[PDB]
């Protein structure tokens, strides 16, 4: 496959519906060697089993709210992969009260702080902690959404955190390019995942998107996985600092409705 | 003038070089009644005297890091202006260590937190506190920079913070529009101010911009003031959620240096 | 008013609903001296009567499909205005067969040629013909639509031509800036005009926009007129090469229909 | 390879430096069956040789200035490929006088007409003539440049033609999606080709981009070829109507090395 010879670290696998699970299956199909992280001890056994099905035994705990957890994880990874070729950042969060109802009434100083810290700062916190372990030709990838570029009802402060994340992709690509590292994002269309159930009226989003999207269907974790595999491979060597829309054309149309 | 009958609150005046100083003078010239805030006691003297030159005696303390400070300021303002027509948010900050050299090496979890809290959350924190005091026809305005959109050397985490602020403008305009309030920003070109001196090699950015901007000069606080007066008047009733470039055309050209 | 001392030429007045009529009214209210053009003799009478109400007796025929007609019109304008301060370009056309049904089936080579010649090339053709009659501080303005940025049903080849016009605004601002000229556009929301009746199902666009636009109403020729007067005045001296959205925020939101 | 089982038509091979040459070599490596077009009889011999080296003997004349030439080509293709899976459009032209010096002085009505007809209309002319020959899952691709988005010295009216082409990509994707066809573009960074050598001072554009691009090199036809192969394969099933930047990050940075 087109990822033979690469070693990639994958975050955010919580279940078989996760975008990260889809990305991991596609990368394994194309020949990558993989390593996995897990947020807390309730996820340990599920992730160890997923990793074994994909030929890996490298499974390490990591909570991105804590600098010490990130550092400890990369020091343990270093025992088996002293050098490696990049990582997939598939992590997002905001307190549940932030994501329902009018935006100005729901947002709070603490909710804004947590959303930006876990969904945007954590991407660069990981790069800082593994910078000297990355080979030339490495690639980093994160996942964003259209709520960074447009106001969407109920998405609320997560749209501000994703806008900071997309800027993070550009500043990171500009800083690390000279040493041979690329950094990009995929802006995915709506997909039913565990976290998806926390967005007020996510079921109407899905139905609507299917009706007015140019390809006339919502995208899958297999479509997102194949694009993620391409963006972390040497086939995408000419692409850096980019946000790639993997939403079936939804954002480039208007008023398809009638 | 075109602001006759309007009452507008202006934050951020720190010297006569300040962008907020040029916005206040243009708003006074067009007939508005004004009110001013000051960050701390070191700036109190100067702001009281500037307010007086523009015929105002409403000058109140406000540090937007604190929810209590914002609430107290608006309760005092409510004694003389029970209802009013909007405000100008001209406030930004990040720790000095964040703005020099490689972005991945300089950024820290706490530097990111402060930059986003003061430069982006504070705009929506003021709106929450005064929402029921705004008349039909009101307008809110904030100030952004091209670093939100492109990676610029040394601007570093302030670029991410400005990206979060421009998304804030979109989400606020969508939430407040139905009750009759508009929300926009000006993306200003580089101007020599007190805060500008904190950006490593600011003087070089300024020199480069003068030579390649289409109008062949950098913009002034008078240019920004006149556009701010327009965006807070009824003349701009058809504009909301927009980021307007007031940089002489710098962002729309490439390779004029050749 | 803020246009006192300026001489501006206005094209495109067809009737009292025209966007150009709202622009002329707003500039007359702000003190400008005006001059007008008319496409054919069937409009001659009306335009002479519209000009007379606004204090003008400068009414000249001009068909922008022909280089000779533009040159003759500016040579006649030169007898009373050898020097002037800019013009408003409010002209668009595509053959009727282009604007109904599937885009790929409807577009033709000649259909495409005419739409781009009249809606985009004519703006720069008028600039070439009066470049040495413009005073320092002059401003040019044109009108665009969201169809340049997004695929909209039935707008079809006009969307490609507006995309070409918006690039034209950037290339003209970059070339003419150094001698003292600014060039910009307004991207207006849908408004009921004579030309508007040529778009298949225009009445549905109108009602849809009214319900999901942040300000909850469609924009008027007075809203567009006031923004146009600002953009051709010295108040907007810091703005060039820009496309300003005057659509009540419609373009920055998504999925507002609940 | 990932294009096994697909049949793709390739336009635009002029020499071994051509972007379409790199695209052909990469699609052949990934298992596609190919067919080629040549503009006129001065190119026939060399394109026949290049095709033979990639195992193809399907080589047909096509000048996209003429509807009859495009129709005859698709009728001849139909004798060996009744159905096929998409095409690559790598074609552009404007008269040489258009690309030298100040844009407003150089552009003419005829120059503008030819630029838009050959660089933008031709993409949709080809789609109209082969629409009933495309299998479900087909993909169409064109090549654009940052001149569409920003004003660049000397590129002049080509920048307006590329803005029209990018809008053409959106309108094509929206019309053809429901029947199973995707349409995208690659916005490539500068590459030394025969056509590139017609732009005044191309040597300087190339050197400047090399120094300030985040990856600190200019892109190759192999980089572009690999991204083109992915975009015409089922690996990119979730992407349509998109303009993918393959310029090493050049467009997302500003003021590097200053
Ligand atoms: N599902 C969609 O429609 C969609 C669309 C666009 C983007 N996204 C984004 O894609 C990413 C993946 O989300 P998903 O939809 O796969 O949901 P998911 O619930 O399957 O995955 C979210 C993951 O975030 C991880 N996470 C949260 N906080 C963490 C912390 N402090 N430390 C370490 N890990 C933490 C969780 O463990 C979980 O595995 C997110 O960034 C999300 O915003 C989702
Ligand atoms: N100067 C430029 O070139 C430029 C260009 C684009 C945008 N901007 C932006 O314009 C705005 C104004 O900056 P300026 O250039 O006029 O500089 P300035 O130093 O004159 O003003 C900065 C203002 O921020 C205020 N401030 C900081 N922290 C605060 C806090 N916790 N509470 C209350 N007030 C606080 C200071 O008191 C000061 O009045 C900022 O948002 C800045 O990012 C400046
Ligand atoms: N009405 C809308 O919703 C809307 C929204 C956005 C942009 N626009 C644009 O605004 C401009 C003004 O249109 P309007 O809506 O006021 O319509 P209108 O029908 O009132 O005006 C169109 C004008 O085009 C002029 N025109 C056409 N061909 C010409 C030629 N060859 N030479 C000289 N003049 C010619 C006509 O004479 C007429 O005055 C157009 O560019 C249109 O695309 C309209
Ligand atoms: N080289 C670059 O830096 C660059 C960067 C971005 C985009 N592009 C674009 O890539 C495409 C390919 O150009 P290239 O750089 O590989 O140059 P090239 O000179 O190798 O190829 C140009 C091709 O255009 C074809 N062509 C011109 N007029 C035609 C007509 N009437 N009918 C049929 N074919 C015609 C020629 O035959 C030639 O094969 C163009 O669309 C160009 O604008 C090139
Ligand atoms: O970003 C998302 C976008 C969509 Cl459409 C659906 C789910 C998303 O992902 C999240 C949303 C909210 C929270 Cl609390 C956590 C995550 Cl991971
Ligand atoms: O955003 C700015 C952009 C420019 Cl070009 C110049 C000054 C700016 O303003 C700031 C920059 C840094 C800090 Cl710490 C605080 C502020 Cl107010
Ligand atoms: O561009 C427009 C956009 C809208 Cl929403 C409504 C009217 C428009 O203006 C035109 C539309 C079609 C033709 Cl043939 C001529 C013109 Cl002036
Ligand atoms: O579009 C291009 C962009 C670049 Cl940077 C280099 C080459 C390009 O290709 C062309 C340039 C001018 C003309 Cl007349 C025709 C073509 Cl094909
Ligand atoms: O500990 C409670 C919460 O804190 C956050 O830092 C984690 O990102 C989140 O996933 C968890 O629900
Ligand atoms: O003369 C017929 C047509 O020609 C076009 O050039 C004009 O723009 C249009 O208004 C008229 O209908
Ligand atoms: O104490 C340091 C700082 O904290 C504040 O929140 C900032 O806005 C800055 O102006 C102040 O100096
Ligand atoms: O013959 C002059 C020109 O006409 C064509 O339409 C072009 O595309 C170009 O390559 C040819 O040189």
Structural tokens at position C104? 């790929």
- Asked if residue C130 lies in contact with residue C86, where contact means CB atoms within 8 angstroms, the answer is no
CB-based contact (8 Å) between C193 and chain B? Answer: no
The shortest CB-CB distance from B241 to any of C177, C241, C249 is to C249
- Asked if residue B89 lies in contact with residue B143, where contact means CB atoms within 8 angstroms, the answer is yes
Residue D118 DSSP label: I
Q: How was it solved?
A: X-ray
Residue C10's SS3 state is strand
Structural tokens at position A174? 């500009």
C-alpha C154: how far from its chain's center? Answer: 21
The rounded distance, in Å, linking the Cα atoms of B225 and B223 is 5
The rounded distance, in Å, linking the Cα atoms of D161 and C164 is 7
The shortest CB-CB distance from D208 to any of B201, B208, B258 is to B258
- Helix B67-80 / helix B122-130 crossing angle, nearest 10 deg: 40
Going by CA atoms, what residue is nearest to atom 11 of ligand 4?
D90
Residue A192 sits at the vertex; the CA angle it makes with A118 and A105, to the nearest 5 degrees, is: 55
**Residue D151 and residue C164: Cβ atoms within 8 Å?**
no
CB crowding A238-253: b at 16 or more within 10 Å, else e: bbbbbbbbbbbbbbbb
Structural tokens at position D212? 């300030």
Tell me: is residue D23 an annotated ligand-binding position. Answer: no
Give the helix ranges, DSSP H, for chain A: 19-29, 44-53, 67-77, 103-106, 109-116, 122-130, 157-176, 202-212, 221-231
How far D47 CA lies from chain A's nearest CA (Å)?
26
Largest Cα–Cα separation, chain B: 59
Each domain of chain B, given as residue ranges in start order, spans 1-258
Chain C residues near residue D174 by CB distance under 8 angstroms: 103, 151, 153
Residue C228 sits at the vertex; the CA angle it makes with C222 and C230, to the nearest 5 degrees, is: 105
Q: Which atom of ligand 6 is nearest to the CA of B90?
A: 17
The rounded distance, in Å, linking the Cα atoms of D88 and D53 is 19
Query: B17 to each of A80, B21, D44, how far by Cα in Å?
Result: 57, 7, 67
CB-based contact (8 Å) between D208 and chain B? Answer: yes
Helix (H) or strand (E) holding B27: helix B19-29
**Residue D175 and residue C103: Cβ atoms within 8 Å?**
yes
Cα(B122) to ligand 2 centroid in Å equals: 12
- Asked if residue C141 lies in contact with residue C231, where contact means CB atoms within 8 angstroms, the answer is yes
The rounded distance, in Å, linking the Cα atoms of C129 and D118 is 27
Ligand 1 proximity of A203 Cβ (cutoff 6 Å): no
CB atoms within 10 A of CB A222: 15
Structural tokens at position B158? 């302030």
Which of B147, B150, A183 is CA-nearest to residue D212? B150
**Residue A253 and residue D226: Cβ atoms within 8 Å?**
no
Domain B1-258 has CATH 3.40.50.720: yes
How many helical (H) and strand (E) elements, i.e. helices and strands, does chain D have? Answer: 9, 7
Going by CA atoms, what residue is nearest to atom 10 of ligand 11?
B93
Which residues lie below 8 Å from residue D50, measured CB to CB, with a gap of 6+?
D13, D16, D21, D24, D36
Instruction: Please count the residues of chain A.
Output: 258
> In angstroms, what is the C-alpha Rg of chain C?
18
The rounded distance, in Å, linking the Cα atoms of B30 and C226 is 15
- 3-class SS string, D52-117: HHCCCCCEEECCCCCHHHHHHHHHHHHCCCCCEEEEEECCCCCCHHHHCCCHHHHCCHHHHHHHHH
The shortest CB-CB distance from D258 to any of B153, B214, B252 is to B153
The rounded distance, in Å, linking the Cα atoms of C84 and C86 is 6
């Amino acid at each position: 496959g087109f990822l033979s010879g690469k070693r990639i670290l994958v975050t955010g696998v919580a279940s078989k519906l996760s975008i990260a699970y889809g990305i991991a299956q596609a990368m394994h199909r194309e020949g990558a060697e993989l390593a996995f992280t897990y947020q807390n001890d309730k996820l340990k056994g599920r992730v160890e089993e997923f990793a074994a099905q994909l030929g890996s035994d490298i499974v390490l705990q990591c909570d991105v709210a804590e600098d010490a957890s990130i550092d400890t994880m990369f020091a343990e990874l270093g025992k088996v992969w002293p050098k490696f070729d990049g990582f997939v950042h598939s992590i997002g969060f905001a307190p549940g009260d932030q994501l329902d109802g009018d935006y100005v009434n729901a947002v709070t100083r603490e909710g804004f702080k947590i959303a930006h810290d876990i969904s945007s700062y954590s991407f660069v916190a990981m790069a800082k902690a593994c910078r000297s372990m990355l080979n030339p030709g490495s690639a980093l990838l994160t996942l964003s959404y259209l709520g960074a570029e447009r106001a969407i009802p109920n998405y609320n402060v997560m749209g501000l955190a994703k806008a900071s994340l997309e800027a993070n992709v550009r500043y990171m690509a500009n800083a690390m390019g000279p040493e041979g590292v690329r950094v990009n994002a995929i802006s995915a269309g709506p997909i039913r995942t565990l976290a998806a159930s926390g967005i007020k009226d996510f079921r109407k989003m899905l139905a609507h998107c299917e009706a007015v999207t140019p390809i006339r269907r919502t995208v899958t974790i297999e479509d997102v996985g194949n694009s993620a595999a391409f963006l972390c491979s040497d086939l995408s060597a000419g692409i850096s600092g980019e946000v790639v829309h993997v939403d079936g054309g939804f954002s480039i149309a208007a008023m398809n409705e009638l």
